[PDB]
Ligand binder design. Structure first.
Ligand SMILES: O=C(O)Cc1cccc(OCCCN(Cc2cccc(C(F)(F)F)c2Cl)CC(c2ccccc2)c2ccccc2)c1
Ligand SMILES: O=C(O)Cc1cccc(OCCCN(Cc2cccc(C(F)(F)F)c2Cl)CC(c2ccccc2)c2ccccc2)c1
Lengths: 220, 15, 220, 15
């Protein structure tokens, strides 16, 4: 049963979320890495709006954002996926398909799981509330490396879990599998994070440079 | 610390 | 509400689950790798008893078992963890602490997350039914590499999810967070699987040889 | 196939 406090919290989260494309290969890469920077900036802005987040130590904020950023970017990307054209649209105007990503020099091993995830997420047909809560739940993962106040992180995570459960019970009143199905996507996101670290590793083999913000959160 | 090694993220958080 | 069919299925799963320790370092390693072989054999025997499993293609059986084996081994290990002595007991008689594992040549980066997981799992106090269902749910992961009948794998997984939800509602009638908390451990298991692939990689740098069964499922 | 590359697991499954 969705409480007034939960309703108000979810609505607030939803409300909080409301180089040119043409070496030539590396102009595409610069365009994409620049869009990724925009996503990371938005992730940080949203995190700061999450109840409980700014009360964690700044070090715990950084610990959580360092490793959740790729997962939240993947969630945000899934949300922008167009099943009919099999494309993903960034900043409302920039639409891209698998070939576009390959042309930027990204590996097939990276591209294909992200498209497969995006397609599986699309079948779920999550709305803005469900995406917002799942992003919150991904951010408040107590098992991230270097988290100090694991108890508080876990406590926070559970309040978002409980809100998602109650919300989904109104959105999907005859399908009790929707709630766990959503949660189970967080499992796929963990595997995808390791696919991502493999792409980051390959970029440095190729002497392909991540811009400073991206390098800071992802380079070893 | 993580903080000292993540200047840009730290600045974004401080804003 | 737990149905008679679900009750009978869970009971069946539960019922289905009912070299000496002293280079000298490598005798410890041989002892541990041999115990791991016993666990893998048990995992395969249990999988064959899971409703739906043997109706998948043999290739899909192998796809699911190849990548779930480490996760199921980790679940089984968590279940054998003794919080008071901070030890893990294998085959009822062989008990080991962190130092014992380090002495076998296993990396600290491997040992410490497994102990941290085991401790977090222990706090949940899962019973035989909950472990059995979570193992089933881990095995029936449609997103594993090289799975053909993803729809059928997912369909199966959901029946175990629904059984766990109903069971936990009887086991934990006043705590609606227990069910999702259990599911969320599957997320940690995915990260741990990548910690494991890093240990496997380090063993081959060290020219340390996995026995044939272990080499077959894990070596690249 | 995975099957051809996993003989021991395959045999365990066939038992
Ligand atoms: O649209 C908006 O509002 C802002 C927004 C939201 C979400 C994403 C976004 O830009 C992403 C640009 C595409 N991209 C860049 C990228 C992301 C993560 C890591 C890397 C790097 F490590 F390789 F550098 C890169 Cl280059 C890639 C994109 C992708 C989608 C589909 C297939 C392959 C790659 C992606 C990858 C991971 C996570 C999210 C997107 C802007
Ligand atoms: O007790 C039983 O009934 C049978 C049983 C059940 C579960 C596990 C088990 O034996 C595991 C022996 C300990 N072990 C071996 C190992 C497992 C996985 C990979 C590797 C290798 F790749 F490195 F080779 C090894 Cl050596 C290690 C054990 C562990 C526990 C705690 C800290 C560090 C390591 C472990 C690791 C991963 C998964 C499960 C156990 C017998």
């Amino acid at each position: 049963q969705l409480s007034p406090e939960q309703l108000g919290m979810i609505e607030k989260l939803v409300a909080a979320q409301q180089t040119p494309w043409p070496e030539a290969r590396q102009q595409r890469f610069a365009h994409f890495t620049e869009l990724a920077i925009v996503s990371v900036q938005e992730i940080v802005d949203f995190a700061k709006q999450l109840p409980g987040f700014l009360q964690l130590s700044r070090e715990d904020q950084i610990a959580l954002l360092k490793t959740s950023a790729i997962e939240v970017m993947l969630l945000e990307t899934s949300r922008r996926y167009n099943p009919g054209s099999e494309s993903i649209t960034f900043l409302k105007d920039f639409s891209y398909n698998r070939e576009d990503f390959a042309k930027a020099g990204l590996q097939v091993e990276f591209i294909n799981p992200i498209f497969e995830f995006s397609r599986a997420m699309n079948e779920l047909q999550l709305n803005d509330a469900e995406f917002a809560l799942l992003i919150a739940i991904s951010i408040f993962s107590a098992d991230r490396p270097n988290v100090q106040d694991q108890l508080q992180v876990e406590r926070l995570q559970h309040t978002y879990v409980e809100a998602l459960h109650a919300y989904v019970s109104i959105h999907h009143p005859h399908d009790r599998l929707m709630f766990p199905r959503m949660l189970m996507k967080l499992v796929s996101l963990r595997t995808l994070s390791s696919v991502h670290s493999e792409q980051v590793f390959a970029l440095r083999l190729q002497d392909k440079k991540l811009p400073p913000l991206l390098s800071e959160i992802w380079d070893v | 610390s993580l903080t000292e090694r993540h200047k840009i993220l730290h600045r974004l958080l401080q804003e």
